[PDB]
Design a protein around this nucleic acid. Structure first.
Ligand code: MG
Ligand code: MG
Length: 69
DNA sequence: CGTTGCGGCAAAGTTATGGGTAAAGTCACACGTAGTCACCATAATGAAATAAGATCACTACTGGGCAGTACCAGACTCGAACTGATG
């Protein structure tokens, strides 16, 4: 009906019967994620005060402690 | 006198309403919302044009003066001659 990107919410999860390597990390600085986004905020210039559009934030996260590295 | 129905009194029973606390749900993070014709009045030239103005050329009408002519004396000047005083 809508496509694969819409059925992605109706996906079967992965449930661990046995214990493989842990998904989020055995220790800090083992698995760390990089991801970009654009912040939902309009920013103004510091000198001339025009609309500069929405900025972009990139995050590096330690997946074990979920810490924003 | 004893019994029976009726009514007051005060817990007791049932709903309702505004509080607190853990615990089942809920939903966005997944690159994204701003973006684009349609609209008719006003300035604003630049061109188109003006309506009158400017000058040429011709036609007719009407003031009107200059080089030259002419006479009638009055008046000053002077050839030519007359005539008187004189050394
Ligand atoms: Mg992203
Ligand atoms: Mg977003």
């Amino acid at each position: 009906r809508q496509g694969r990107r819409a059925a992605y919410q109706h996906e079967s999860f992965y449930w661990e019967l046995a214990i493989t390597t842990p998904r989020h990390g055995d220790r800090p600085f083992e698995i760390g994620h990089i991801a970009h986004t654009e912040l939902d905020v309009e920013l103004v210039c510091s000198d001339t005060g025009r609309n500069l559009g929405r900025p972009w934030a990139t995050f590096l996260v330690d997946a074990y402690s979920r810490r924003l590295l």
